[PDB]
Amino acid sequence: MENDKGQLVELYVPRKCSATNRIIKAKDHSSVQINIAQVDEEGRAIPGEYVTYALSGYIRARGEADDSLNRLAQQDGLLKNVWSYSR
Amino acid sequence: MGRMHSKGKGMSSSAIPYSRNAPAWFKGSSDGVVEQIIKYARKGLTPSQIGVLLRDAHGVTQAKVITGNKILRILKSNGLAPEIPEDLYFLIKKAVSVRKHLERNRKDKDAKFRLILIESRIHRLARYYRTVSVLPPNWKYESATASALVN
Amino acid sequence: PQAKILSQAPTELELQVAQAFIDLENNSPELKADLRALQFKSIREIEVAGGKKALAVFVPVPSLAAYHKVQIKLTRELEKKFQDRHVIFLAERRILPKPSRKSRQTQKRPRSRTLTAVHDKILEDLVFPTEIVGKRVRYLVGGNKIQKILLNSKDVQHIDNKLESFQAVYNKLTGKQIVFEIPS
Amino acid sequence: VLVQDLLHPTAASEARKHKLKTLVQSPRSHFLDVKCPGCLNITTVFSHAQTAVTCESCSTVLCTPTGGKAKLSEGTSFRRK
Amino acid sequence: TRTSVLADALNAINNAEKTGKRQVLIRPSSKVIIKFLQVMQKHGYIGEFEYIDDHRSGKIVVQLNGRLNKCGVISPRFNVKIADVEKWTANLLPARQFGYVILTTSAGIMDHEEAHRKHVSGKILGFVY
RNA sequence: GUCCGACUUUAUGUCGCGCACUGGUUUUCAACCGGAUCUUUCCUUCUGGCUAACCUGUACUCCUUGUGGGUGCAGGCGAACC
Ligand SMILES: [Zn+2]
């Protein structure tokens, strides 16, 4: 990735699945990127400011997409106790 | 789930409790438990029946938990261990029973195969008890020796 | 009778503990009739955080049986007499190194004299009134180990605050850190 | 399912699973203190007993062997240990 | 029968990684498994594992973070002379810039680079990358 | 310290490659390997050598009143070695 002088020679350092840490292929035509809008004090969706989660196509095909999104949103303080860490 | 001499795959067993030490609710004495084991052995009972009697009629979960020694070990310390180990003796009894059933009716081939299986198991267990030197190195299994040991 | 209850060279601090044992022996109906046959193996002091201290009495081990039968009473009376010092009734066991192949044959080392077995017994006898019901071991990412001990929820009332000091003692004995957790 | 605790699963799930399959394997059996209407002796018996347990004072059975656990003698009163 | 326990451990890790999980439950939990996972922790291919005492061989709970892609044992623990380490790395590791042939030397269970640093070599345990 | 590349028949003052040779390398650093030490933590140990070495204290102090430093003989350190 790194040239000896210290400049990048890689192209498009790829994204990674936010739920399984696996990279997203360029032609991974099943993967999605969810955007959740930030909410201010009076419930007004602030425009242009949100939080993004890149869900891979593999987990979506398996069927763990919604559960992974539940956990990931609960961790960053979006949903209250929607997901329990102990099944 | 191996079933050495068949195609079975069961795992029915017993889970020994995590705590090795004595149960909190047990009030009996270890010396009394050893005396009970000695008396049961003198009655002419194998260690497994001794353990089952201590578990059912009394609060003894298991001898090693209460005393610190095993049932056969306790008997051996007092010199009551049988000259043939219990499992091998029961295999001998089963083999002689199937041989009796065979010599009383020849045409039953399934029991012949089962006798072959039992004899193979007897040979394996005898080999194990021979390398540990529980049995003398000349110990072996033929016809009319099983009857002599059983009777 | 101060000297008889310690089979070790005298030390000023341990003489006071022996005198406290005589004062315990003063009470007849339950603190006598078993406590006469008592000894010691050089009780030692372990510093606890926050200025607290942990005295660790060292049984020769043949007396542990009696010591174990007596422990709860003697502990609470000693805590009454000894302030801020938590008393722990530890065993003393001979830890043997393994025969190096270049070392010479001595005898079959019994596994009870080994480091893990001795440490397991020490941690099990670090507290009588409660029993160890689970042992977990977690190796942190940074490369250090922790031995969680899960103790019975029943009989937890005896050890209300000694847990931390327990930790310290084990640490001071081993350097192997430890975290106590009580399951629900 | 992708993220889940195995070190601390729910106790309901603990009773859900089979013995020999828990985190640490523990028996589901227990002991009982039975009293027979005959005398006042308290007898310690096993849940899954395998013998016709009787009080030493009277020749009256208190349990009965069964493919699973013990079936009592219709008149003995027990308390779980 | 269970012959090579470390094989079962690494196979379980591989299966629970390919499916996208973050944890494994390895049952038998010997010394060698502990040392192998400790090396993987040291090199980052694994997360935060755990030993669960049962008084019977214990167990291990392994936390993953998706960084690993394949474990694997070389089931016949071949005597690997110090000259043959490079051949094993070429045949097993995908690139020279990373990967680690975990091998057991007399100085303990170590990655191949550490063993080459000590200038000591022994039998081969497995490979991680 | 040593100094060399831009300044060209030369250099230093200069532009620093951020020192082309050699050190303080306890500047914290960070390792990468060892060695000895304390664990209830032994690495075969003695038996005479040889006592190498100072826990020896005998005659004592060369020199600033200073344990820096010693001429030295019975105990007595043996992995420093036979
Ligand atoms: Zn009755």
UniProtKB/Swiss-Prot annotation, chain A:
Pfam families: Ribosomal_S21e. The keyword Ribosomal protein applies. Its main location: cytoplasm. GO terms for cellular component: cytoplasm; ribonucleoprotein complex; ribosome. The keyword Ribonucleoprotein applies. It is found in: Cytoplasm. Signal peptide: none annotated. Belongs to the eukaryotic ribosomal protein eS21 family. This is Small ribosomal subunit protein eS21. It comes from Kluyveromyces lactis (strain ATCC 8585 / CBS 2359 / DSM 70799 / NBRC 1267 / NRRL Y-1140 / WM37) (Yeast). The lineage of its organism: Eukaryota, Fungi, Dikarya, Ascomycota, Saccharomycotina.
From Swiss-Prot, chain E:
Transmembrane segments: none annotated. One of its GO terms (cellular component) is ribonucleoprotein complex. Keywords: Ribonucleoprotein, Ribosomal protein. The keyword Transferase does not apply. It comes from the Eukaryota. One of its GO terms (molecular function) is structural constituent of ribosome. InterPro entries: Ribosomal_uS8, Ribosomal_uS8_CS, Ribosomal_uS8_sf. Signal peptide: none annotated. HAMAP family: Ribosomal_uS8_A. Belongs to the universal ribosomal protein uS8 family. PANTHER family: 40S RIBOSOMAL PROTEIN S15A (PTHR11758). This is Small ribosomal subunit protein uS8. It comes from Kluyveromyces lactis (strain ATCC 8585 / CBS 2359 / DSM 70799 / NBRC 1267 / NRRL Y-1140 / WM37) (Yeast).
